[PDB]
Amino acid sequence: SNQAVKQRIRAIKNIGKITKAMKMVAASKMKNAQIAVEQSRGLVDPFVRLFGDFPAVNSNKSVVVAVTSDKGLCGGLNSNITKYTRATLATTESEGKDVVVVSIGDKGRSQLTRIESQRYQLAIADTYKVRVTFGQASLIVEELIKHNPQSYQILFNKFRSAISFKPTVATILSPDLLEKQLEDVTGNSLDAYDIEASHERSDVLRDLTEFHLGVTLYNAMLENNCSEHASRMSAMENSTKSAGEMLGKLTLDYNRKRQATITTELIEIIAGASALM
Amino acid sequence: EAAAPAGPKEFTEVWNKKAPSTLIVPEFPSNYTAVKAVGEGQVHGDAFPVNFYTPHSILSQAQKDTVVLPGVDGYFGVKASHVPTIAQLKPGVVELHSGAESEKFFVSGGFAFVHPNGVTDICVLEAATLDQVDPAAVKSALAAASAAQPTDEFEQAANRAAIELYSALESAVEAKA
Amino acid sequence: EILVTGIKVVDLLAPYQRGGKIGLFGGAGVGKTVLIMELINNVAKAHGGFSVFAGVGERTREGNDLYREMIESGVIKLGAERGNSKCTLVYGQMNEPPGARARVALTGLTVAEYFRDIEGQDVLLFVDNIFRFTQANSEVSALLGRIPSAVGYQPTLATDLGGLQERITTTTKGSITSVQAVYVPADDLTDPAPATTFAHLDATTVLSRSIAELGIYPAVDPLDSTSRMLNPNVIGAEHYNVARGVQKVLQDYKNLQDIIAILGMDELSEEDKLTVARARKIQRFLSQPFQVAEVFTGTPGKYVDLADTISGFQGVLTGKYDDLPEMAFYMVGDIKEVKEKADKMAKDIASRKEADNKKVSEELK
Amino acid sequence: ALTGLTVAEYFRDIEGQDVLLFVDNIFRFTQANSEVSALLGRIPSAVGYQPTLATDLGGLQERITTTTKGSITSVQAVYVPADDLTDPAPATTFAHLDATTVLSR
Amino acid sequence: SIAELGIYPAVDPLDSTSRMLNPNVIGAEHYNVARGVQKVLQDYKNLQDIIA
Amino acid sequence: ILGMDELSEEDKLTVARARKIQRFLSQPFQVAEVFTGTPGKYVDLADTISGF
Amino acid sequence: DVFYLHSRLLERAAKLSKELGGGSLTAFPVIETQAGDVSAYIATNVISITDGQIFLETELFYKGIRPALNVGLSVSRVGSAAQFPGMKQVAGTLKLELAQYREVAAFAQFGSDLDAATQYVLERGARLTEMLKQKQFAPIPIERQTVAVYAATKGFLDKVRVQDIVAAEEAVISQVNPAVFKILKANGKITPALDAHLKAELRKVKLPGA
Amino acid sequence: VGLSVSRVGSAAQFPGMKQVAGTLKLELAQYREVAAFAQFGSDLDAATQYVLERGARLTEMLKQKQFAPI
Amino acid sequence: VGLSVSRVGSAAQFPGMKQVAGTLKLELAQYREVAAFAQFGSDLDAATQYVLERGARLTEMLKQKQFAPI
Amino acid sequence: LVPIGRGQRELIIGDRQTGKTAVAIDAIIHQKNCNEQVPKAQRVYCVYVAVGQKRSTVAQLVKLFTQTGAMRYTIMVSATASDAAPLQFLAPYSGCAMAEYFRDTGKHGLIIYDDLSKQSVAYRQMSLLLRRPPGREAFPG
Ligand SMILES: Nc1ncnc2c1ncn2[C@@H]1O[C@H](COP(=O)(O)OP(=O)(O)OP(=O)(O)O)[C@@H](O)[C@H]1O
Ligand SMILES: Nc1ncnc2c1ncn2[C@@H]1O[C@H](COP(=O)(O)OP(=O)(O)O)[C@@H](O)[C@H]1O
Ligand SMILES: [Mg+2]
Ligand SMILES: [Mg+2]
Secondary structure (H helix, E strand, O other), rough: OHHHHHHHHHHHHHHHHHHHHHHHHHHHHHOOOHHHHHHHOOOOHHHHHOOOOOOOOOOEEEEEEEEEEOOOOOOOOOOOHHHHHHHHHOOOOOOOEEEEEEOOOOOHHHHOOOOOOOOOEEOOOOOOOOOHHHHHHHHHHHHHHOOOOOOOEEEEEEEOOOOOOOOOOEEEOHHHHHHEEEOOOOOOOOOOOEOOOOOOHHHHHHHHHHHHHHHHHHHHHHHHHHHHHHHHHHHHHHHHHHHHHHHHHHHHHHHHHHHHHHHHHHHHHHHHHHHHH | OOOOOOOOOHHHHHHHHOOOOOOOOOHHHHHHHOOOOOOOOOOOOOEEOOOEEEOOEEEEEOEEEEEEEEEEEEEEEEEEOOEEEEEEEEOOEEEEEEEOEEEEEEEOOEEEOOOOOOOOEEOOEEEEEOOOOOHHHHHHHHHOOOOOOOOOHHHHHHHHHHHHHHHHHHHHOOOOO | OEEOOOOHHHHHHEEEEOOEEEEEEEEOOOOHHHHHHHHHHHHHHHHHEEEEEEEEEOOOHHHHHHHHHHHHHHOOOOOHHHOOOOEEEEHHHHHHHOOHHHHHHHHHHHHHHHHHOOOOEEEEEEEEEOOOOOHHHHHOOOOOOOOOOOOOOOOHHHHHHHHHOOOOOOEEOEEEEEEEEEOOOOOOOOOOOHHHHHHHHHEEEEEEHHHHHHHOOOOOOOOOOOOOOOOOOOHHHHHHHHHHHHHHHHHHHOOOHHHHHOOOOHHOOOOHHHHHHHHHHHHOOOOOOOOOOHHHOOOOOOOOOEEEEEEHHHHHHOOOOOOOHHHOOOOOOOHHHHHHHHHHHHHHOOOOOOOOOOOOOOOOO | HHHHHHHHHHHHHOOOOOEEEEEEOOOHHHHHHHHHHHHHHOOOOOOOOOHEEEEHHHHHHOOOOEEOOOEEEEEEOOOOHHHHHOOOOHHHHOOOOOOOOOOOO | OOOOOOOOOOOOOOOOOOOOOOOOHHHHHHHHHHHHHHHHHHHHHHHHHOOO | OOOOOOOHHHHOHHHHHHHHHHHOOOOHHHHHHHOOOOOOOOHHHHHHHOOO | HHHHHHHHHHOOOOEOOOOOOOOEEOOOOOOOOOOOOOOOOHHHHHOOOOOOOOOOHHHHHHOOOOOEEEOOOOOOOOOOOOOOOHHHHHHHHHHHHHHHHHHHHHOOOOOOOOOOOOOOHHHHHHHHHHHOOOOOOOOOOOOHHHHHHHHHHOOOOOOOHHHHHHHHHHHHHOOOOOOHHOOOOOOOHOOOOHHHHHHHHOOOOOOOOO | OOOOOOOOOOOOHHHHHOOOOOHHHHHHHHHHHHHHOOOOOOOOOOOOOHHHHHHHHHHHHHHOOOOOOO | OOOOOOHHHHHHOOOOHHHHHHHHHHHHHHHHHHOOOHHOOOOOOOOOHHHHHHHHHHHHOOOOOOOOOO | OOOOOOOOOOOOOOOOOOOOHHHHHHHHHHHHHHHOOOOOOOOOOEEEEOOOHHHHHHHHHHHHHOOHHHOOOEEEEEEEOOHHHHHHHHHHHHHHHHHHHHOOOOOEEEEEEEEEHHHHHHHHHHHOOOOOOOOOHOOOO
16 A cells, blocks of 8 residues: 555665666776777777787688676677677678687677577686686687687677767788688788798787687687676666666655645545534 | 778768668777877887886876887887887886886787887786886796606696796896896 | 457457456546547447436536447438437436436446346446446445545445446346446556456456557557456367467566666677567567558558457567567558558568659649 | 734735735644644545535635735645645645745755 | 564564563573674664675 | 867867856955955946946 | 536537537636656546647756757647648658657667767757757747748758758848738748749858858 | 465365375465566576476466366 | 754754764765665776765764764 | 365455456366266265345356256355345355255355455444444454
């Protein structure tokens, strides 16, 4: 009757307190994990300066990884890159080739094993519990070069700002399969570089492409972690707004029920007293 | 042969054919990089821009005139307009030069590119300068490394990397002028 | 026996008995006059007997509008051809004192009961605002020297309402199909005068204010309207299973109404987002344009057969129309018109670049 | 409150001044008139107030006006019971209020 | 709500009160362990919001 | 949640104006000068509109 | 008998027949609500008596939108046929566009995302909202309202900024020659002979700013 | 099922049903205290997933038609 | 502490207490504003941690056993 | 889950159209199915009291109980909505007195007071018109 609305008010009030605390928690996490995102942006520059950027390559095998989140109050991030994953994957699979879809974060294994299920071989999680390190991303890249595809698509949300998260695809051509072929311009463009390695160019390109996969995978999950924090900071602001709006309507409903309660109890007392007096 | 012109602007039209018009086109990492390799410039004299990178820290994006890198065929100096190279670095000391002033970082490996537009890029994984490393544990680490040698291939490759890095670090700590 | 009305939500979720009592519960502006006018438009034309409209405590402008529409449509003829008229109007509208509004339903019942008993006919009886009978009895009851019952009504609410409503009965010598609008006083279904009326009816059609505020018309609450005809042994198992599946999807969406509000749809499970999508499709698909609402809405009315309703809601339940958008289901007749509206909704976004319209050298034509 | 308003009305009508009239907690005026109405055996209105609520407030508030001789301006402290602005006493007081000065901590 | 958890007897561990819950009467071991049980149960009742 | 660092100057002229506006609403009263020392100020209407 | 109190009063507002003189009486009852509760007793009594409603929202009245007409809730189903034609020619499209304006109402980019293909419905519904704002004690003749909603609906004001549509409306009413007002008032509809001259006179108006 | 109580419990039902319905009364209670966490779906250790995947079977078992007693 | 008022206030208390409890009620109000953050694991910006430790010790300082006034 | 006993009062409570009459009816039908299987002393004689229901519902229930054969063991006490308030007030007592014959003669009875909240309403009307003072929701004390 009139106690259920008061306990629902007491529910939504500390739900709003919870989400107001969670917004500042995610905001402090976004502020602390911004400098690492700014530092890791440097090392992805020389590899796309050297190897270029060729997303629409015709390959035989491609490992596509979608870097999702771990906990799921982000509010429209892990489904937006699932949409972007299928949108960039239908673009680049019309050669009759095999495609391996991977997800980093266990909110992507819940969203990717029902839309592309039989092409889903690997699921990685818990990468944001302590922090994101380069040895962790190098091990993840080692399980990515367990199989040897001709491309590595990395789907992640680039932390452009605290408001805007542009989803970014990044591609890594494996060396002898696609990289030595996709650089030929009347000869080659890589032949301008004087290889100063121990063994031949076919091995220094192998080391360079594995290191480029590790570098952009580390930067991808770091950018996606910062976008997770900055999207949770906005989703919890929306939850405070909604649980203040719901609380404001439910307060008026409780006031109407309270006024009607005193009126009906008083009318009952007057109707009892008018039968006797 | 260049009969397949892949790229970011060629990806956009195939994405406008096969992916729907509900979503804006995804970004690419070449949209965030203002400096390329073949687009000429950046030298303008005797200096040339350096890019000393670790995965966790940007160590220098200033403009130096001499860069000393520890390549696997030995040390080599990079002056203003070097030949374009891709130099695999061994453990050694990278030395930056601004003139009278110098920065001497000891790196752990990695690569170093010189590009046809005169820019250079040093891509290491851990670059600790020489006051941050102690000379007491490098000899303890080499004595714990070069003595116990497993004949297994993975452990002996790790041991070869250990004795190479610790020997270069021992030869680098007392060779400060 | 079923009585098909051409309304999708009525024929699907709470079908009307052919000789039963029907209630249209409503909250002052939700559309129980538009619904009863559409039931007059759809049912009384296909009927073979006489209609008796009892206007109890409603607007006099509405009685004049119904009189002019029934003269124009030919079911009321004037002068010498008056014997070929098929409707009797009995009007006790809200300008009358509470003694007149308390007994004008009895006059409508008497005119209907003569056709049922003596004439042996099958009668239709539409009573607009049977609440006004109860309200008039509560108005006169304070001056008869009675102690009031609950919230302010007369002590004899249930027995007066019972003595009225038990005269409306399909007997062995004639049938009355009674459609009674019931008014809930302050959108309170727990008010004693509609709560007493709920036990007298075979099919309640509870119209809701929130469904009307969503723009859905007729604003029938699907999880509050019931009927005794929704039974698998009387309307067949296919229709019954479709109605129960639609009610299950709507109840599962109503269970998620608080998580979607305070968290958004992005935190729902993948199985529940499909439930929300199918429920937002079926709750636009329950809405329907009316032939009596076309004068102020502009869209032409849609009469929908029963098999089209079952065949449409089968397709939306099984998942055959996850391609089409949610607004393609809104205010359309059948499942064909959903596809023929999703065509027009995607011709039109391709009609952003069709031409530049200019009419030149025209001023001296 | 009628006593204080009469002392203000002499300054309005006879002196021809612009007098101020401060009513501390007009809700207590409403509550006292509700208690007087309840002691006289009258049936209470909605939530517990007097049936004469709008007219007992209006008998006070309509004498606070500007005339051709002078004006009475009134600053009334308003208490809101259970912080309900839709309670009958603040909702009936707010139909006469020409301004509102919120003082906050 | 305690009996809806299957716990019987469904005594509210917080809302139940006695005059004997006094360290001068039942002893400072019994009183302190009862106050500690009520403290940890009130702490869990405050955490039951953020758990859900 | 962010600070003065991420405020635009278009959203910092509003801060620098609103702070001195909410200062300028304050005013010393004549009836408080017997215990606050500073004298009271009577501000005209035209002076208020001009000064704001 | 508090329903009978208002039904006695409001049923006397009628339109009499031709054998009773043909006169009319139009009622405008005013009901005040508490906190926007229109499900109250007297509110729902007079709603179930009167023909339509004019819901004046308290949220739009403090956002400067005056008159604060709740366009989603306020209906009028008796004077819908008794509308000035020409205003019936444009205002149906106006109400349809304000209907599909309330499909993105206050979640343009406030909630999660912005489409930028439905930026047009937002930056047109804001123009149709600022068109209907109107200052107090200044009623407009209907022939000067249908021309203003013609300029707001046919697209003659989309390049005007939202801050100056209230000045653009009075500039349209001042700069268009007053013959079209007399023709639209006498003919009672925007004729096909009139919309060409109206689009002629609507493309030579000096909309300020922009 | 969380509000429908009877005073007798045992000693007033079928002795065959008494052996079987205790594992029903317990596992529906296991289903009800889990299903208030059905907004996230973390499926903790395949145990909170399993108890709802049995309790949904029990609630679907308990349904029956009308005018057809068993 | 948030719902307890004294209209006579600080004008009728101990002047030794008047200079020290004035900081106390402001610290407790700041602790009440941030009291939702207390049951969080990821530690905050260390300005709210300072008040969340300070007020949580100040609320322990206001405890008192029965029938032993100070 | 809610096992009944043979002398136990069990309240079926819910909102409108939530299946309370269905549970009571299926109980009566199951007593018909069990009465043709047990030896003459565990046989259960149902009594259905319809308080305040309309007469079409009672006629439909009589048609159901005759077309399934449950009317051989069932009595139906029917004070409908058209009846007076003391008739609906007194019909659960009439049904209980008719069902107490089987309880007092060694047999086993089953009594369903359908719409006891309508018998309370009829009692409220009957006592308010006798000018007895009203109480909670104007019910008698
Ligand atoms: N086990 C069941 N399976 C399917 N339908 C059922 C079942 N039980 C009840 N119903 C349906 O629910 C509707 C309401 O049934 P019932 O009359 O038993 O409820 P009620 O509470 O007695 O209704 P009222 O309150 O109007 O008397 C009926 O139309 C019936 O068909
Ligand atoms: N089927 C419908 N289509 C369009 N509008 C409707 C429909 N039903 C109701 N409405 C709107 O709701 C209002 C309901 O008025 P009315 O039919 O008199 O209901 P009530 O008698 O409950 O007040 C009408 O003004 C109408 O604009
Ligand atoms: Mg009506
Ligand atoms: Mg029943």
